[PDB]
Design a protein around this nucleic acid. Structure first.
Ligand SMILES: Nc1nc2c(ncn2[C@H]2C[C@H](O)[C@@H](COP(=O)(O)OP(=O)(O)OP(=O)(O)O)O2)c(=O)[nH]1
Ligand SMILES: [Ca+2]
Ligand SMILES: [Ca+2]
Ligand SMILES: [Ca+2]
Length: 342
DNA sequence: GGGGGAAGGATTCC
DNA sequence: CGGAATCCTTCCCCC
């Protein structure tokens, strides 16, 4: 089996450069302004000229400006990037019917019934890269291997504007030499848990009693890692379907006053329904971020679709249920809709 | 005992 | 900052 993974380079920043070439060459930082105060919010992403100095996704906008006060700061226009993304995804579909659109800037293609060796795979990769650059002026990185995981690791190793195949012999070296933290799905929590168990590489997961691994990181995660370690991980590329749509917003100032929170909540409901389109959810959750940055939620699933009117009244109750069962103030409020009636 | 859900939260990654 | 998926634990009803 042959998997080709595509990951767009510094996506949001690069789309902005495509729409405004005068930006190419200088540091470009795409941000998500939270509105709490001047420059409050975070960096969604930045082009490589900016990353050289530490400005990257996730850092506070205020820290970014300290490092690169004269860079170009742009507000995130996610809708524009989404449409550019869709077009690129359609281009990729022209290379395989078996495509898994993982996120707004990445996808997996099962090109097994399209090519036979890694040679023809690599070449197909270059053609895909050329096609995208030519058509959307977007550079991307391609990773090729036997499964989704290593295809993705391959690209990570080739970033940016690269292409990289990880063949069977290297898959074995990685299992032995790859920091397990560098394995997709293994975050800081899980990685520290694995270190304590003496597991630093995929290979190590094979020298521990399963039940011990299971008990420490969970069944799903334990089996996942063991599969990879045994060089047996093999999940098929399949069409992913959105399972929830939501919106959470940061308020002007903290509060526990219902009348002061409701408009933010409703606005979130309004935006969520617009985005819902023709989808009808049977479930609703109201989400609150306390002053101490904790995230608390209360939801409800009914036996039928939720109308906007129902969403409004129910959401009010759930918020009321949150405030009554938590002494903290609310910093951010939102709603999420799921269990669609399709 | 154990199947089948639902609710709330933990993690992870874009 | 903030959108969203998967998986985990506890709680429940029920035969
Ligand atoms: N709001 C927000 N958006 C993010 C964050 N991280 C990534 N994104 C968005 C914007 C990124 O362009 C897009 C793709 O993420 P990657 O993880 O693929 O980063 P990006 O493509 O920007 O750089 P790259 O060349 O892949 O290293 O997802 C984040 O922490 N917050
Ligand atoms: Ca990505
Ligand atoms: Ca990317
Ligand atoms: Ca990691």
């Amino acid at each position: 089996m042959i998997v080709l993974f595509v990951d767009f380079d510094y996506f949001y920043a690069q789309v902005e450069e495509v729409l405004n070439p005068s930006l190419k060459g200088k540091p470009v930082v795409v941000c998500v302004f939270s509105g709490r105060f001047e420059d409050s919010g975070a960096v969604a992403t930045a082009n490589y000229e900016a990353r050289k100095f530490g400005v990257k996704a996730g850092i506070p906008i205020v820290e970014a400006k300290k490092i690169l006060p004269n860079a170009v700061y742009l507000p995130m226009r996610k809708e524009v990037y989404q449409q550019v993304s869709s077009r690129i995804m359609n281009l990729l579909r022209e290379y395989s019917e078996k495509i898994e659109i993982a996120s707004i800037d990445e996808a997996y293609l099962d090109i097994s019934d399209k090519v036979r060796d890694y040679r023809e795979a690599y070449n197909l990769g270059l053609e895909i890269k050329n096609k995208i650059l030519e058509k959307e002026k977007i550079t991307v990185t391609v990773g090729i291997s036997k499964n989704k995981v290593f295809a993705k690791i391959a690209a990570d190793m080739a970033k940016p504007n690269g292409i990289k195949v990880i063949d069977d012999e290297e898959v074995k070296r990685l299992i032995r030499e790859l920091d397990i933290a560098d394995v997709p799905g293994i975050g800081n929590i899980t990685a520290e848990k694995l270190k304590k168990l003496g597991i630093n590489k995929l290979v190590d997961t094979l020298s521990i009693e399963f039940d011990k691994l299971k008990g420490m990181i969970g069944e799903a995660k334990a089996k996942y890692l063991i599969s990879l370690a045994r060089d047996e991980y093999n999940e098929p590329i399949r069409t992913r379907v959105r399972k929830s749509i939501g919106r959470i917003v940061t308020m002007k100032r903290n509060s526990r006053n219902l009348e002061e929170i409701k408009p933010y909540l409703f606005r979130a409901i309004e935006e969520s329904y617009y985005k819902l389109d023709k989808r009808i959810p049977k479930a609703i959750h109201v989400v609150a971020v306390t002053e101490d940055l904790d995230i608390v939620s209360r939801g409800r699933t009914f036996p039928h679709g939720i109308s906007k009117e129902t969403a409004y009244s129910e959401s009010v109750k759930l918020l009321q249920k949150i405030l009554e069962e938590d002494e903290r103030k609310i910093r951010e409020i939102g709603v999420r809709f799921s269990k669609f009636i399709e």
